[PDB]
Symmetry: D3
Subunit: 297 residues, 6 copies
Amino acid sequence: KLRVAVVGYGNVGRYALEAVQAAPDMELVGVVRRKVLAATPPELTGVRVVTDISQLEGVQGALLCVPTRSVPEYAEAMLRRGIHTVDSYDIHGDLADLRRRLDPVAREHGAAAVISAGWDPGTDSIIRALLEFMAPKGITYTNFGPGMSMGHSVAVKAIPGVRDALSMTIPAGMGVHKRAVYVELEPGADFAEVERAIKTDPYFVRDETRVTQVESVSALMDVGHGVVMERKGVSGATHNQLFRFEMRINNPALTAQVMVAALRAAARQKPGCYTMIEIPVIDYLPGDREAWIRKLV
Amino acid sequence: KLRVAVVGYGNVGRYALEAVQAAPDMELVGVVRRKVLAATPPELTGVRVVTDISQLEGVQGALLCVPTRSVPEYAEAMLRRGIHTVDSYDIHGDLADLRRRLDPVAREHGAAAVISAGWDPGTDSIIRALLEFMAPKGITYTNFGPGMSMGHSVAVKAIPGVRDALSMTIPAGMGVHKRAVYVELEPGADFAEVERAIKTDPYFVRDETRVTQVESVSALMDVGHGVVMERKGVSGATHNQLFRFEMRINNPALTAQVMVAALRAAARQKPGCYTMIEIPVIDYLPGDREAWIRKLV
Amino acid sequence: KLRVAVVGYGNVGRYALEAVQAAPDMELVGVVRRKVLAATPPELTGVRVVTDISQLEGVQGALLCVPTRSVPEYAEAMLRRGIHTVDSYDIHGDLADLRRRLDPVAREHGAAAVISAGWDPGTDSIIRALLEFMAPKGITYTNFGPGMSMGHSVAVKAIPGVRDALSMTIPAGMGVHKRAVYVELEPGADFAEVERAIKTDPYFVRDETRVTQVESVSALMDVGHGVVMERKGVSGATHNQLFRFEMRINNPALTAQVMVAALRAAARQKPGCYTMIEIPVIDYLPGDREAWIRKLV
Amino acid sequence: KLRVAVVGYGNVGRYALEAVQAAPDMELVGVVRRKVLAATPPELTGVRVVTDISQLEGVQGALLCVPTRSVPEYAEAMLRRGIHTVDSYDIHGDLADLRRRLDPVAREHGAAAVISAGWDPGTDSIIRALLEFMAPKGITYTNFGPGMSMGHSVAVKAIPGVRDALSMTIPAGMGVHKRAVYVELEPGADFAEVERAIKTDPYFVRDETRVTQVESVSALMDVGHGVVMERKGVSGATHNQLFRFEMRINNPALTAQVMVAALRAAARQKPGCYTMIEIPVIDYLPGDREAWIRKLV
Amino acid sequence: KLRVAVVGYGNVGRYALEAVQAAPDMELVGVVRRKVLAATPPELTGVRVVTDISQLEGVQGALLCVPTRSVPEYAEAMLRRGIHTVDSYDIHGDLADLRRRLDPVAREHGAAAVISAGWDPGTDSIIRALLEFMAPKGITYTNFGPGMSMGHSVAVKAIPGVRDALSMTIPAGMGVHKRAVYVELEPGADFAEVERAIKTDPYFVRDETRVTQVESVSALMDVGHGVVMERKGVSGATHNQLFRFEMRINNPALTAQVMVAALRAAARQKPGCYTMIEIPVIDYLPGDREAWIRKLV
Amino acid sequence: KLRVAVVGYGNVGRYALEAVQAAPDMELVGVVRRKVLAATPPELTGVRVVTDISQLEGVQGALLCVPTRSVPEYAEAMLRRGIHTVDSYDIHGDLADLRRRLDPVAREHGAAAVISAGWDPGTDSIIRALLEFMAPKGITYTNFGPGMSMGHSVAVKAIPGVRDALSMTIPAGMGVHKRAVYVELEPGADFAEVERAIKTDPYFVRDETRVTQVESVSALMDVGHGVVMERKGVSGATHNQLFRFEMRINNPALTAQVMVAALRAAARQKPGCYTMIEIPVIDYLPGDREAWIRKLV
Ligand SMILES: NC(=O)c1ccc[n+]([C@@H]2O[C@H](COP(=O)([O-])OP(=O)(O)OC[C@H]3O[C@@H](n4cnc5c(N)ncnc54)[C@H](OP(=O)(O)O)[C@@H]3O)[C@@H](O)[C@H]2O)c1
Ligand SMILES: NC(=O)c1ccc[n+]([C@@H]2O[C@H](COP(=O)([O-])OP(=O)(O)OC[C@H]3O[C@@H](n4cnc5c(N)ncnc54)[C@H](OP(=O)(O)O)[C@@H]3O)[C@@H](O)[C@H]2O)c1
Ligand SMILES: NC(=O)c1ccc[n+]([C@@H]2O[C@H](COP(=O)([O-])OP(=O)(O)OC[C@H]3O[C@@H](n4cnc5c(N)ncnc54)[C@H](OP(=O)(O)O)[C@@H]3O)[C@@H](O)[C@H]2O)c1
Ligand SMILES: NC(=O)c1ccc[n+]([C@@H]2O[C@H](COP(=O)([O-])OP(=O)(O)OC[C@H]3O[C@@H](n4cnc5c(N)ncnc54)[C@H](OP(=O)(O)O)[C@@H]3O)[C@@H](O)[C@H]2O)c1
Ligand SMILES: NC(=O)c1ccc[n+]([C@@H]2O[C@H](COP(=O)([O-])OP(=O)(O)OC[C@H]3O[C@@H](n4cnc5c(N)ncnc54)[C@H](OP(=O)(O)O)[C@@H]3O)[C@@H](O)[C@H]2O)c1
């Protein structure tokens, strides 16, 4: 049974606690937070919560449920302690570089790191790889939403006159996305100004963006999300092969569960850093291989 | 470039030829048939066709496009020659045992074998594994068709009074399948009896079966097929996670293309036998890993 | 404009009245009924209604909106008067013979008859013909409903213990249909007996049938109906060509409109009898061909 | 059997070869190409290939699988030799005029010509005509794709800084289409300039267009295509009649098969030129009419 | 049995007549029109038609099928006569104020008024309320069409050079709508200018608008319409609850039927004015409550 | 702010705790359980838990999250204490009688009771009522699943030789349902026996039932569920009006949230007992009516 720690008790972190507790081959040693207040969250009543992973006895693996930009530093800190790490780093543009950066650190400390192990990047990545070799010629389209965007939401809220905001990702089709922004204005903030400020912002200038002022943004929030991946391609020399994959899921819940499966896999790999398509899928399953082969193949 | 041979020029074999010719990292050395007639099929005009793989110079990998029951003997024959092998062996209840049987043969002759590498078993198996770890609790349903059934058609054609027949697999839902049989009666035969013999045959006795007599079975044949895989499960402790995968494809065309990708992967493994869920998905992709990670993850 | 008469003021007849009035190239001369009561239906207030088509001056075409079994004698009666005729005779197994029977009658009296011109048989027939030549090899499935069934309902009301009944046609998929019967029992009739008689009747004996006793059958009546026609076949030697046609329509409304278009075509044909697939489609369109070619091709 | 020749061995031509070989009522006499090299394509090994149709003995019909702008001269050349002709000329705005031009040429040489016989124009045209008379009032929407666009792709390759390109037709709904262009730039060409030139070109100027630079255009090519035709209209005076037709097919494969069926019909017509809606649908079916009436109506 | 009068014999009024005649608990006393010509519409032959509701003996309820702007004055006129009233007033931004305006008028004359009782506002409003309390946090999207737009069509028809026009409402998703305008130009008018005047008009300036010139607008008219309402929200603290409601209906037919049900409810309320969400749903059903509870709950 | 108690800390009870805590107009006073163990569930750490509702100060309303058969006694016990009550009693056959039984008890103690307030019975009941008056003639079909059935599951588990079981409700279409049973056998229990015992049981004899033996039933459980309600009917005299409502939700989560909304409504009613269709929908919404009318109608 793998001794694991949840690092970062945020949205994903809260679901990670549950995923670890539900895992048959793992034991939750504790949670690592930046601060630990006297008032204990109800669900953490019988859970060890500290600020230093060192105080969690025999930790073998860590789920890095921290902000994207904090992942690099956290992974290196855990790896240098010989602790296997998993994160759902979501920047497609440079996770490949993150992989090269963490590989030597992981190896030199006898640990394994699996990066970008959420649903996208993550499991969606595996699916895209499958579609790619099943029909080498053609185009795969990944359509996200409806669901909220963390990055886009923060960007809008950082605008003067904006008390709080919600940015919805809407699938327009063929891999194109539009934005539906909902904003809660400050004292005498002018909507027109805020509206153009949003549409102009580099985060929305590239896509069709619509803005709406609301009384309460919190009243509109839901972490449900989804994706539709499609490919029309050529298998060998045979055209029009049609594939479609769709999910309607709780975003953080799925991410945390995939992270758990990835940490299970990490503990079984040779020291180094890996993305999800570099690990045999059976390594994400608990227990002996034989039974899974008979049940799933 | 991997030198490959197509063994068995049947339905899948014909597509395998095309899949190999289209692969950027493979070279088709030739085709192995039980017999080679003087009348050369048009598309094989510039292709080396022989009855013994030994006559195909420098073959490194073999695509075993032979009947399911012939796979075991063919795989051992090729492996004992040090030739990597791929097959799409389709018996879910026995493939695990085939794996154990071929493992030492492959290993002792420095070769790798990837078995059951079609779409089901095969790629569908990978998808089922993903759904399984993304939402550990729940049920996955695999719905096949509409499409023609392998053995079912032969089973009916073996009935007295049946000139030729076609058995369609029809999805009834919840992983249950119906059978739509089309028969071309032999001069004199009685439909009523044939209809009874079919519905009572062990091959159909367990599923809803409907029989129809037709003037020509050939006029009804189409190798298109498909599948709908669904799962409603729990990620961690979060219920109602919804997943759906569907494809509408040319059956043998997809199978042959997956076999090609699997052979590419086999050549990159340690000697032994593997099912598709025991191989990192990136090994099914041609060339350098880096490029694929940046493109797909 | 073509002078037309509506024969039989029933369900389809009521809609035919409207279809003719809306046609830009036709003039409604009148309606022919078995009897004409003193109480005139509101919508027929300004319409000539008689018991003999001879009383309708200059009639050139007749829409035979009479029961299926009455069509043969009605068509011969009209044709022998030199009047073009259209009907939506719905017996697929007898259709061809009706064509042979009416052909010489129509020809010898210088008139044209278009039979079975509803949506099925009728327009669905044309679609089936199209799918057949677009992909010669494969299977076309015609799935009807949900919608009320003609004879099935009358057949149920035929049993003694039934005051009124409604038989719904339910698509089970792959061309198979289920029956949902609703019955209003006579005071004292046993439901169990009726339920048994229904499922036993040769009208439901070979189809999954379910019975439900209801307070009022009239409260469940709706003339909406539909169809889904699908085909997965081979174009040339290319497999898995996928086609799908679906309609959700008012049954008698569509039937009456198709009959109108067919009568327009009939007036354009050489004397004789025709099914809808024996007439160029442009003949079903009003006016000059040139305009339609530019608008539709 | 009708003796037929395939003129133009391009995309559609390659499929036409197969469609003719599979036709039960036709005999492939040969293929006519602009040039015949010493290296014979494998599939043409046992086929007569020449540069002048006169070298193909007893040819009665010709499938003109040449570029759109070449159809007029090719059709007149064949017709003046008394050879029936079929083409899938795709310009909706000129179609009618081509018909007028070829009609007297066909007639004076005792031959029949069926123009624009692909799926659109072609079979889609018949479907549009059906929907039009089934519900005279309303609007029919024809939504194409996803699939590759003919001229659009060549038009993009027309710009200087483009080595190769692919233009995808994307259905935006309600008969509106979007463009997804993929370009492979020449060493040194500026993407910004190309992107601008594309969106500016009169081919995309009036449609939402998006451009993406790609490593390889060939790796994105797939000949699959499709259409969704819908109409909500009035049958008689009854509103909201709903119709829907959809296809997911191999573009050239379907086009070639329709051309074959149209040539069969042409040989059955009085000398002159016809579009597909001017021919009874049963004429597109092989053999005796009686059998088809019983099987399809 | 409630004695009812239909006020305004327009689109909705014509259906209201039928809805009242079909209601088991209502008696149609007559129709109130602005003028009554000597030429009686066929369907009104046995119906009392007058210009003053006072001539309709014992009227207890009135269905106000008049233009939106006329509703206020008509409702106050009927209420001041002690006659219960129902209207489908469609202005979402002002109906709350209409409610406050009519409340004291209805109360002081012992009558009840139910306003905005169509499908939207109306039944859609009830559905939105249900979704709102079933999942308090999240967003509900109401997508209309395809279907003809009320004011939009009139707004275009008021443009110089426009003989007649039709404005189609097209759902773009996420509660956003597109406009497809069809215009029939007056002899001489310039399309380019009309097209500009339309797209710039306040009625379309906020949505994507496309204009098309046609020979006949009447040939494109169909009163079918529809809606798709969706919500992804949080029930309690559980995210991703998914809801979807859709209908494809005859617009005025449904509106008139809902108005009838609302009038039935009005007659059962304490004097005052009500929107549809202020009435228990069982009050919209005819007769005794007990029977409905057993049949529907 | 309404002071509320959750009675019964089971599946629904656990979600009810969350729904009350999330409600803006309610205050959770505590939870009433049959027993209170020393080991406190983490999430109940800061919550008052007792065995007698009397120990919860100032309780005004109670959510009866107890077994169906316990509802009658619990409701009467709470009502006799002057506490408003809500339950999701799910027996369609006699909830009408429960209503008559609780009405006088509620009234005589100055309290209000809203029974059967889940999604079915409950919100689905409201939807069925709407469809009923929008189109009075026709048939509404309620299709449940996929999702688990509590009753059916218990019935199977009570069978000798059955360690544990799971009964899935599968929609077969048109209001017909099939059962997919999963069983975990005891020591030497014979499957064949258990299988027929299930198929024979009155709980499954009425429907198509399939049985499967599994290693672990708990590994297959998920509380997700759903429904598809459809109606094709007549509005007035206009046929083929089409309606569809679908939900994919967490079963207990939705039920608890609806119960909260119903308790809010109960507190606003005259003393007595009500089903959900007897309460204006706006009463299920928190706060003043004005704002909801403007936001939703
Ligand atoms: N790949 C995917 O498919 C996918 C999908 C969804 C999310 N994700 C990843 O999941 C990450 C976390 O998501 P989330 O919604 O859980 O974020 P979150 O709610 O903000 O949680 C992050 C937690 O880390 C700690 N933290 C906060 N700010 C920090 C900082 N500035 N420096 C160091 N630690 C900080 C806090 O926990 P304590 O208070 O306990 O310290 C905080 O609650 C996302 O950023 C994204 O990268 C990936
Ligand atoms: N896993 C999947 O998803 C999946 C899907 C589809 C198919 N498959 C597998 O693919 C296998 C082959 O399918 P297929 O349609 O290509 O079969 P096929 O058409 O019968 O071709 C098999 C070929 O094997 C060669 N052969 C060698 N020994 C033979 C023998 N004893 N009897 C007959 N042929 C023999 C023949 O080619 P020569 O004449 O050249 O010797 C024959 O044409 C299937 O049996 C199945 O196991 C798997
Ligand atoms: N092909 C299709 O797609 C399709 C679809 C729907 C219907 N149809 C055909 O069209 C027929 C239409 O029937 P319907 O729905 O309009 O209702 P119906 O009850 O068949 O009405 C037929 C009318 O024919 C007249 N009539 C003459 N002889 C009659 C007789 N012997 N018995 C009863 N009526 C007689 C009556 O009008 P008067 O009182 O004015 O004499 C009667 O109302 C269907 O039965 C079927 O044959 C075809
Ligand atoms: N809430 C919804 O979901 C919804 C949906 C659809 C429609 N509606 C409502 O239904 C209303 C009526 O729709 P409609 O299509 O029936 O309108 P319409 O066709 O124009 O009919 C309105 C009738 O009102 C009478 N009338 C009285 N004063 C009039 C006036 N000042 N100008 C013109 N007519 C006047 C006329 O009948 P006489 O000639 O007999 O006097 C006229 O035919 C719409 O305006 C809208 O408010 C609501
Ligand atoms: N209408 C709908 O749409 C709908 C849908 C779903 C469920 N429901 C209703 O919700 C009800 C409860 O569902 P559930 O899944 O929460 O059931 P459950 O998990 O068994 O919870 C019932 C709770 O009541 C107490 N209890 C158990 N047995 C009892 C008994 N024999 N006598 C008195 N109290 C008992 C227990 O709480 P303590 O241990 O705290 O005492 C138990 O946890 C269902 O029975 C059904 O009627 C309705």
